[PDB]
Design a protein around this nucleic acid. Structure first.
Length: 337
RNA sequence: AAAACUUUCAACAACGGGGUUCUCGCAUCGAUGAAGAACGCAGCGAAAUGCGAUACGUAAUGUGAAUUGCAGAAUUCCGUGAAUCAUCGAAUUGCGCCCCUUGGUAUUCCAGGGGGCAUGCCUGUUUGAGCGUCAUUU
């Protein structure tokens, strides 16, 4: 009953998102994740049911939008599934599986929750692709980060570059900005929607690309020190240069470029470190031992992106250490009221 | 030889959609070209210079055969006259007159150089003229 009540909280009695509630909801998720992990079998019994509930909604909206039936909201069925509560769900599940699938908790012992990775990935990928519209690019980014976390913890190979490169043909990633009202920067971390005012604006394009570049950095930083990275990079550098050579937006080409040369640089790094290897690809034991001495952040893509992460992390801190003060200032006013 | 076709979403791509008038307040004019406008101006010009629809300018005065990258006027030239000429006080490039000084065969003709002179009016100096009037034997 504890698990059922907690995850039902994440379904219906979910807290409206805002920069105020993010640490609290993050604690709720990071906490309920632990409860599922305690009972290996029973958790598998519970989550597998509830994730299936999500799939039902997922299947109901896909069919409803696609079919001609005027039953319930054929055109705008996205409202049912493109909600924070649903994204809260799919994030909490990635956190749960990540927690249960960690290498130390694995301890050389298979856990049942790992078998739910495939259903969770299929659901998330099915949600990301259901609308390739700019209005919901922030939604894609959050689930993308969740999948990156799941792959980091479990080591499962998630293909996410096809999605990202598929969005790189949009009207925001490709066409020049139309308006520039100089509104506030969009809170990509803590929002799910663009709100129709940031659409086709200099700020929104500049922030979308800011997130996208760092997401590429993270995803290809996962394999920064693996021997397979060269051939994980080649199809991406070619396609990126194709887009870079054809993209009109100057700022985007500059950012995309940086990732391209750093990817080639880490490819050269791994090549020079792999030229000294005597064991073939089949020997999994040695393949997992490659550069265990070298820290991930010391690689050219790590040393870059790690710093970028700080340049992002600090920003969020200065937001909180700012917003916190606003309330403090607000409190002063009721003192004199 | 597993694709096509209909429908609904979704993208992506086409297609698609200064004047004029009224009111209000403020009070500050110059013959030396204000504020404002704009073809960019020259026969053909980019910069430089010059100028203001009278626009590389108009008037007046002087000089005296040019301007010049091209074209084209010419100057009746022995001068009323070009010049992206000068001066400059306000294509008219209008209309003129005469004196002084040197030379080239020089009494004719020519070439230089210099200097004045528009007209009207007032005052005064100088010089003449009038059959206008008049004195004129101490």
């Amino acid at each position: 009953t504890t698990l059922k009540t907690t995850y039902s909280t994440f379904i219906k009695s979910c807290r409206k998102t805002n920069m105020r509630s993010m640490p609290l909801i993050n604690f709720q998720k990071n906490s309920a994740a632990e409860l599922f992990g305690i009972d290996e079998v029973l958790g598998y019994q519970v989550g597998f049911e509830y994730i299936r509930q999500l799939a039902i909604h997922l299947r109901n909206t896909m069919n409803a939008t696609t079919k001609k039936s005027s039953k319930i909201n054929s055109a705008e069925a996205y409202k049912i599934v493109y909600n924070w509560q649903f994204c809260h769900s799919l994030d909490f599940w990635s956190r749960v599986l990540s927690f249960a699938c960690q290498p130390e908790k694995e301890n050389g012992s298979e856990s049942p929750l790992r078998q739910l990775i495939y259903p969770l990935v299929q659901v998330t990928l099915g949600v990301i692709r259901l609308i390739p519209t700019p209005q919901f690019f922030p939604l894609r980014f959050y689930l993308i980060k969740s999948l990156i976390r799941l792959s980091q913890n479990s080591g499962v190979f998630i293909p996410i570059y096809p999605l990202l490169s598929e969005i790189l043909t949009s009207t925001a990633f490709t066409k020049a900005p139309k308006k520039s009202p100089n509104l506030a920067a969009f809170d990509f971390e803590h929002n799910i929607k663009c709100t129709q005012a940031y659409l086709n604006t200099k700020i929104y394009q500049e922030g979308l690309s800011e997130q996208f570049v760092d997401l590429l950095g993270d995803y290809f930083a996962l394999y920064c020190k693996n021997i397979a990275f060269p051939e994980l990079v080649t199809p991406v550098i070619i396609s990126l240069r194709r887009y870079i050579k054809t993209s009109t937006n100057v700022k985007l080409n500059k950012r995309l470029s940086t990732v391209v040369e750093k990817l080639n640089q880490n490819s050269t790094f791994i090549q020079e470190k792999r030229s000294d290897v005597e064991f073939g690809p089949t020997n999994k034991s040695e393949v997992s031992r490659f550069l265990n001495d070298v820290a991930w952040n010391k690689t050219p893509l790590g040393s870059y992106v790690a710093v970028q992460r700080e340049v992002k992390e600090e920003k969020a801190r200065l937001m909180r250490e700012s917003m916190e003060e606003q309330d403090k200032e607000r409190e002063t006013e009721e003192a004199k009221l």
